[PDB]
Amino acid sequence: KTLLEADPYSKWAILNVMGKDFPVNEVFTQFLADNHHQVRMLAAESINRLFQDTKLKALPLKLQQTAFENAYLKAQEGMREMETLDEIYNRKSVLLTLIAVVLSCSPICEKQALFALCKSVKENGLEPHLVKKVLEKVSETFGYRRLEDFMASHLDYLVLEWLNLQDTEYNLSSFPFILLNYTNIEDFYRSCYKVLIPHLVIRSHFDEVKSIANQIQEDWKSLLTDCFPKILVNILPYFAYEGTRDSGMAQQRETATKVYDMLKSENLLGKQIDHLFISNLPEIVVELLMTLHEPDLDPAPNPPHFPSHVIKATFAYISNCHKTKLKSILEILSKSPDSYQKILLAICEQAAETNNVYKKHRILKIYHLFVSLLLKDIKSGLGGAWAFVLRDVIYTLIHYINQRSFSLCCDLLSQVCQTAVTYCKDALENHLHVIVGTLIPLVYEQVEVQKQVLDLLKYLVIDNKDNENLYITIKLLDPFPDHVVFKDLRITQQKIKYSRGPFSLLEEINHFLSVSVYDALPLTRLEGLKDLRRQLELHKDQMVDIMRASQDNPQDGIMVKLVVNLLQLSKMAINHTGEKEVLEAVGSCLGEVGPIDFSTIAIQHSKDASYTKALKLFEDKELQWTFIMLT
């Protein structure tokens, strides 16, 4: 164990005996089947060294899998090398400890270890109570609230690997359903038919699904209709990726072809296949998205996993095979504009419900693929949904940035802003200020993060400063006095800001009020507030004559307007993250000016003119109610 700590990779940890060299890992695994019992538990506890670096870094996939299979075969040999019940139970407990530690310390080999455990439950005859207990221990070790939730996250791989062993004793009825909390196989069917049926659909077990359905008090037609998207996302992709490239990879295409042909039969769903396909378009694209895998150093996803190019070809083939024979899936997806909506609601919900960082990384690279698919067919747009989808994706990206992968998120934001400023002139005219003002406090981060932030800032302030529509947006934004390294930004910020000359105190206050009414997020304004403080500190002498000019109309005081604007911003920010900084900033800003008698008693709350005029032009109470509710 000590030398495994020293040299996990075994670069020089090779021991030579009788002229033959042996790796230390094989020697360590050899002690698993020692005659003395006490060696077994210690070896099971210390085998953690072969699945992680312990210098929390992981290990290469090949080494981890070969160590796992070596440990499994050694445990099997120790089982089969056999009063007796005592050491039989001891060997079973040692095997369970091995299969539990490999689950705990090796997230890469989760699925394979769980499949080995479920096979060994019936093969080795493991005690049900002990294995169940270690299952719930793992469940609340990882963080899952219920053990059934942990079971549901990998049951598809379990059943698929069980059925891919082509064994007579390994059938659906022989699946170890006792492991889950369901009392009887009927409850297991009721709970997991949506997964069990699609696995056997590709295997042409229609008699099996009929025999399950007629005994489950449910119609087989409805059950197959419910599982129709999941079998679509299985058979349909096989027709696209490198058709007839090689026989080994073309046998799947051939069996998919025959399955699709027999599903086109009159008795089967072939009569209404087109109607069901049109009915739920998001339900199949979500499954086409979640099946993405790039073979770096990530846990193995669900057994159906395809690379990015396979997904691209699948969408291309689905678009081509349509009766109208379009070129892109997004064109027929534009027939129902809501399809783009709830899919954005779909991919998000699985990301927030999970807490694993690796699963989050997988779902965010899937989201990268989806946004790339969105942006490669933006020439004609997504109908009238393009503005909504770009706003949704940019706000989701800024939320994922604010919750702290990160480089990939920066790639998404860069790509979407590039597309918006290239193929449009007003896409980023309003929802850009928060993005610009959000990544600045991220400068004090890793070198890659800082480099990406600086690159995005210089792209926004150099390559987009010539846009006529974006001139107002770039002119109206908060300064960045944070670090010296932003001098370039400074020498491209004061030019536009001070194009007409040096702004006075009144001009600075007017600009601050305009940017405050322009943006609804008080946090991103923090730096600007700091400048406002300087504007209150250096230019105190200018607060007299201005108030001399406001005596005629005291009810429109500039200073009181600034005070009430800061008060409104504080009221908005009182229930937001990072409140201790924005509250301190606004308090310091109000502390630069004393309680000057404004000769007013009433407080007027400024409101956007658009909302007031919309209310004014609505002559019906119902119309106003609908407008305010929708807003």
Swiss-Prot record:
Entry keyword set: Acetylation, ATP-binding, Cell cycle, Cytoplasm, Cytoplasmic vesicle, Cytoskeleton, Disease variant, DNA damage, DNA-binding, Kinase, Neurodegeneration, Nucleotide-binding, Nucleus, Peroxisome, Phosphoprotein, Serine/threonine-protein kinase, Transferase, Tumor suppressor
Conditions for induction: By ionizing radiation.
Protein name: Serine-protein kinase ATM
Outcome, altering L390P: In AT; decreased phosphorylation of target proteins
Substitution effect: I394M: In a renal papillary cancer sample; somatic mutation
GO terms under biological process: brain development; cellular response to gamma radiation; cellular response to nitrosative stress; cellular response to reactive oxygen species; cellular response to retinoic acid; cellular response to stress; cellular response to X-ray; cellular senescence
Resulting phenotype, L196V: Found in a patient with early-onset breast cancer; uncertain significance
The record's account of how the chain is modified after translation: Phosphorylated by NUAK1/ARK5. During the late stages of DNA damage response, dephosphorylated following deacetylation by SIRT7, leading to ATM deactivation. Acetylated in vitro by KAT5/TIP60. Deacetylated by SIRT7 during the late stages of DNA damage response, promoting ATM dephosphorylation and subsequent deactivation.
Region of interest called Interaction with ABL1, as start-end residue ranges on this chain: 298-307
Note on domains (UniProt): The FATC domain is required for interaction with KAT5.
Subunit structure: Homodimer. Dimers or tetramers in inactive state. On DNA damage, autophosphorylation dissociates ATM into monomers rendering them catalytically active. Binds p53/TP53, ABL1, BRCA1 and TERF1. Interacts with NBN (via FxF/Y motif). Part of the BRCA1-associated genome surveillance complex (BASC), which contains BRCA1, MSH2, MSH6, MLH1, ATM, BLM, PMS2 and the RAD50-MRE11-NBN protein complex. This association could be a dynamic process changing throughout the cell cycle and within subnuclear domains. Interacts with RAD17; DNA damage promotes the association.
Substitution effect: H399D: Found in a patient with familial pancreatic cancer; uncertain significance
Outcome reported for the amino acid change (mutating H36L): In AT; uncertain significance
Linked pathology: Ataxia telangiectasia: A rare recessive disorder characterized by progressive cerebellar ataxia, dilation of the blood vessels in the conjunctiva and eyeballs, immunodeficiency, growth retardation and sexual immaturity. Patients have a strong predisposition to cancer; about 30% of patients develop tumors, particularly lymphomas and leukemias. Cells from affected individuals are highly sensitive to damage by ionizing radiation and resistant to inhibition of DNA synthesis following irradiation. Defects in ATM may contribute to T-cell acute lymphoblastic leukemia (TALL) and T-prolymphocytic leukemia (TPLL). TPLL is characterized by a high white blood cell count, with a predominance of prolymphocytes, marked splenomegaly, lymphadenopathy, skin lesions and serous effusion. The clinical course is highly aggressive, with poor response to chemotherapy and short survival time. TPLL occurs both in adults as a sporadic disease and in younger AT patients.
Species this protein is from: Homo sapiens (Human)
Known role: Serine/threonine protein kinase which activates checkpoint signaling upon double strand breaks (DSBs), apoptosis and genotoxic stresses such as ionizing ultraviolet A light (UVA), thereby acting as a DNA damage sensor. Recognizes the substrate consensus sequence [ST]-Q. Phosphorylates 'Ser-139' of histone variant H2AX at double strand breaks (DSBs), thereby regulating DNA damage response mechanism.
Expression sites by tissue: Found in pancreas, kidney, skeletal muscle, liver, lung, placenta, brain, heart, spleen, thymus, testis, ovary, small intestine, colon and leukocytes.
Family listed: Belongs to the PI3/PI4-kinase family. ATM subfamily.
Subcellular localization: Nucleus; Cytoplasmic vesicle; Cytoplasm, Cytoskeleton, Microtubule organizing center, Centrosome; Peroxisome matrix
GO cellular component: centrosome; chromosome; cytoplasm; cytosol; DNA repair complex; extrinsic component of synaptic vesicle membrane; intracellular membrane-bounded organelle; nucleolus
GO MF annotation terms: 1-phosphatidylinositol-3-kinase activity; ATP binding; DNA binding; DNA-dependent protein kinase activity; histone H2AXS139 kinase activity; identical protein binding; protein serine kinase activity; protein serine/threonine kinase activity
